[PDB]
RNA sequence: UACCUGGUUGAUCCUGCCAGUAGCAUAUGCUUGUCUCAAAGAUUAAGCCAUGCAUGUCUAAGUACGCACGGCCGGUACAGUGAAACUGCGAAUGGCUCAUUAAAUCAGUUAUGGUUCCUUUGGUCGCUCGCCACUUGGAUAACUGUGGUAAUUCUAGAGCUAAUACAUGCCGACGGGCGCUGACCCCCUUCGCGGGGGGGAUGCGUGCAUUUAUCAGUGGUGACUCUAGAUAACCUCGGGCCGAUCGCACGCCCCCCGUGGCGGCGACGACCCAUUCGAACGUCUGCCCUAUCAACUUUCGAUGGUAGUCGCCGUGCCUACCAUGGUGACCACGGGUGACGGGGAAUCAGGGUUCGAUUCCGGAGAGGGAGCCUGAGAAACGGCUACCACAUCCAAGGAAGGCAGCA
RNA sequence: GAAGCGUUUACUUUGAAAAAAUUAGAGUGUUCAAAGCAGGCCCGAGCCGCCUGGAUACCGCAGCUAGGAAUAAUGGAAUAGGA
RNA sequence: CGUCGCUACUACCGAUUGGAUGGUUUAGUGAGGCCCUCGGAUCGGCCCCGCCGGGGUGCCCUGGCGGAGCGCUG
């Protein structure tokens, strides 16, 4: 069958817990020092950071 | 009774029985030669399969089997079967979830070639893998070891 | 048709087993050869990679061997007189691959008195006089009878073959596969194997 | 229904037939197929009866007996022109073969000879 | 199935063929020959992927019609032939010869070879025994045979063999110390000395090589194969002598390259 | 990110669940400007299907006397382009679906010294002593003509014509060599004998493959009843091999002569061996729930032995005769599964819990069973045959079906 | 260098072998990313072309191999039928 | 707290030798294929041999009708 590919991943993780004023107002702060367009960009970089602190995270435990 | 029990003559195809045996040698008597081979592995023929007089075409040394493929272990279990017995082998199968052991066994029908004779319950015996012998039987005794034994009071 | 798949046994512990595929080419059965003793009927089968099987259906001759006296003979079939599986097969006499059969003694007769030179099977003689008198005495030179002469010591048969061959039929043992080869070969009985079938005949018949 | 040599009634029957029987040709090797054939027996009911005139009456029946009519096309084994024209061995044999003359009144005429094999 | 496969998937490729997924369903599913399919190239690939002369399997198939691909001396116009391991590829237009040796990577790269050096390959004695009237039949890596061979080569020998007459030219014998390249496994592609070899009857002999850096590695006795005697190849030995670097090794290498060619 | 919050009470600590919270995976609602990817009749019905397509195929190298073209270059077998048809091969791959299936499939491991194998590639094709060979016979296509039927990829009679279709069948090697049988001859201890041998006329079979029986012990195994030898024979009329094939440029020898004998490159073909692709059956270990399933299997093969039949092969695969065995609380057997198995996916402290119909691998199936032909390979279904269930046309005499292929 | 183990296991370490895709992950500016397996160097134009990659890790349990001998299981000579 | 009274909903039991839907085996019948033993509607060959006939010389080189050999065979 088709020799297509369908490899992809998600960019980013939504909060555990909605409505935070602390998580709120930071996240508006950065979004409005920043520019950016939405909360999904903060998010995706927020996963960024995660994917790169777990990969040194791991490394260090080894 | 004598050796040919059955309905046909039992004898080892390799060996041929009628050398001409004339006035010019004394009648007899002429012991029939005994065929047997070394099945390999390190593993020794025993001197029953050397100069017994049985005759069995699955026996390991003096039959038309090849042992190849797998060398394992038991316990004898029973012996109520015409040359071949059950063995009963125990070993652990790890449960990753629990990291403990489950204590299991299947049973294994095996070709006893009438050259071990001191073969009773509870002897370690190995088997070798050859061809399909019957239904369920694939391997064959190579070596039998006793348990605790050879003191009979 | 006829199957030889394992599938439709049931398994060790007992327990039925559910078949999970229907009946394959591979695991074909065909139905028994039955071969008779009669004028000669040969059938081809095609069999698995277009190889060639001869189902013989009827035999007269087969290739026998004496053993002893490494002489090979195609000789013809008598009949069936015992065999090891059952008693039916001799009732309506088919040859399978161990069957007992009686055969005619008349080319290893001619063997043993074109080799040896020892009129056997002959009870009082001078009665083929123009074919086995030239044989039995040749008129030939003094080397050659210092070569048969030596011959004449190890000529001895044994009494059970004697009475065979003053009988005219020898019995004996297929080795081959009517059914699979399409012939009937086999070898004679001789020595212990020898007795214990004629014991075995006879506790049939005696 | 064409009708089949030994079935040896007359009606109908369902007859499996395999290659080379009659009444049949296979679409594929092995193929068998199970036809209706009319029996070898004739009777009042039968569209066309196929008859061949095996030796010729005192006169000739207006177009059946008379005007023969020429084979398409001669032999083409060297060994069936040398029966034909008894050749015994060897005598111009290429020259011998029948050539057949195309003569079509659009076209230039000629002559064609056949490719002969053996 | 019902019969044999004559199919095989794009993703199902040898990993060694470097083949991408996304060009295609299918993969070139090599043509029957003497060598097995997981670890030969059909000359598709080696074309088309390797030296890029061609662009599509048409275009090879255009070149092989044109009978100028001559293996082992003898002109193949199948696609999808299995070239195999040190077989010769011979370009006689361009002048161009290769000879299919793995890399350190375990891959067959491409090694150009003279042409008085592709007039000879050397072979694995796969087997050897006796036919009709006690001929002697000797039957390679390959699936060649050979009458007659001298009776000092046995099983997983070595012999030197030319080309266009199928004779024996010089052998190799196995023995410690010679010089040997592993075909198959995780240490494919390595190049190394025989140290040590252990005989388990009834199953496989595993033989111990160290190369030339001190690595000791191991390998079963199916997958060794020697191109030379000691110290010294029979062959010239592809780019990287066959040795394998750590994963350090390539990242300064290629560190060096790119601070030198910048 | 190793996380919690509301709710029993007048109020407090708890237990405990309910609700909240976040992810994905189906449906659905509202809404939707751009662009790159990208799932998609699995769940219910492996229910039923109109229609169209999805498997055909030619190089110089099997067979062209089709006028369907055609160069003719002109007395010529065939220039060449070639329909159609025969021959060969493929159609057993792919694609789809997940109904069946609970030591079954399947995963890893190992074996076949217990089997087969189209094709590719490499070996073998003067290895046998044995009045056509400068080439043997017959038939059918295609094609012409006469039809039948309402109808089908339905076909009959008649007349042709070829093979790399179907058959048959030699020369050549080829001088002989070997093992028997040995007419007889010669040299012999010589003597009144044997004598130890050299020859030999006449016949008998010789090679590979098959089936027996026997003898001996060139290579390789861990271990052959292996391989290679030797002997005595068999070698099946639906009966093994021992080239009656085709193309390309064309050349050498000419004493004998003068028309013959010789040559290269291939293609096709083969009995057998090896390889490749495999396949098939086995070895060890591993699977969800259920005891409101605790004893099963064994008349009717259940476990094993002996000898056979069948099968490509090992084997209760099957038969005959025997023995009474075989499996179970370490869960047999039975039942259920909204179970095809695995690689994997979702969630993510660690450990786990669920989901894998779904593009890769293995299996199974083609409406439900069953049986077969051909073929290396099918128990095939875009092959056939029969029954059941559906269902198409008919002039009512019959004929024709298989979308869980793409739409 | 040939042979054997002064038991047999369990256990632990190493090595072989363990399809690919997917997982983690190396390199590469897809205009960034999801992806993909590419690509980069100069060209004064004749460069009558040069340099690379397509790693690596993981792959439970069972099976094979080589080291260790703590922990745990099983044994040797008691009527000596002992070495 | 329970009976009793009203209204809904939920399973349970029940005659119907329950009814119906369903999936495995015993006994009997049994299509079809395959195998075996017969069977021979036909289609060939040899002996053609009633004949014209003839060559190395009524001793038939063959060219065909036709009888049909009323046998032997595929
Ligand atoms: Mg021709
Ligand atoms: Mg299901
Ligand atoms: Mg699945
Ligand atoms: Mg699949
Ligand atoms: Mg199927
Ligand atoms: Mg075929
Ligand atoms: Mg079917």
Redesign the interface.
Known sequence: ???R?WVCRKTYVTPRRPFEKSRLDQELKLIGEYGLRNKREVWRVKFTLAKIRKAARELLTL | ADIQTERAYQKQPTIFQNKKRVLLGETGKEKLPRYYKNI???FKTPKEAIEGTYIDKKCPFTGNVSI?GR?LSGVVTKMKMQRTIVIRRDYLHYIRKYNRFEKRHKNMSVHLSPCFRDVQIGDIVTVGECRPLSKTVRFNVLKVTKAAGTKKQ | GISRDNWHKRRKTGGKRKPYHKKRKYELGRPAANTKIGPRRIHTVRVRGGNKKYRALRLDVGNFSWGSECCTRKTRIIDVVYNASNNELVRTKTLVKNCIVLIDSTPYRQWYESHYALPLGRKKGAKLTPEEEEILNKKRSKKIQKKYDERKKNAKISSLLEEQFQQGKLLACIASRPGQCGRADGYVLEGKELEFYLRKIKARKG | FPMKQGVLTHGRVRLLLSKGHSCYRPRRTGERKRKSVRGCIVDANLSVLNLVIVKKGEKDIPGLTDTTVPRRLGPKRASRIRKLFNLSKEDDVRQYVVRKPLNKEGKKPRTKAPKIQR | ARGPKKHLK?VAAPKHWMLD?????FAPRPSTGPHKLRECLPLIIFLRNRLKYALTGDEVKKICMQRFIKIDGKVRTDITYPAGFMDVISIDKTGENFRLIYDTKGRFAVHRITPEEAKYKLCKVRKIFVGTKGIPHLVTHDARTIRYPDPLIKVNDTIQIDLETGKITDFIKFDTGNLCMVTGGANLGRIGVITNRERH??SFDVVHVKDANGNSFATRLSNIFVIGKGNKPWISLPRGKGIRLTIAEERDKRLAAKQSSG
Do not use: F, Q, W, Y
């Open positions: 069958p088709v020799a590919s | 390999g592995l390190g190849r060398i | 794009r997924k996304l060009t295609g369903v009857p009834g």
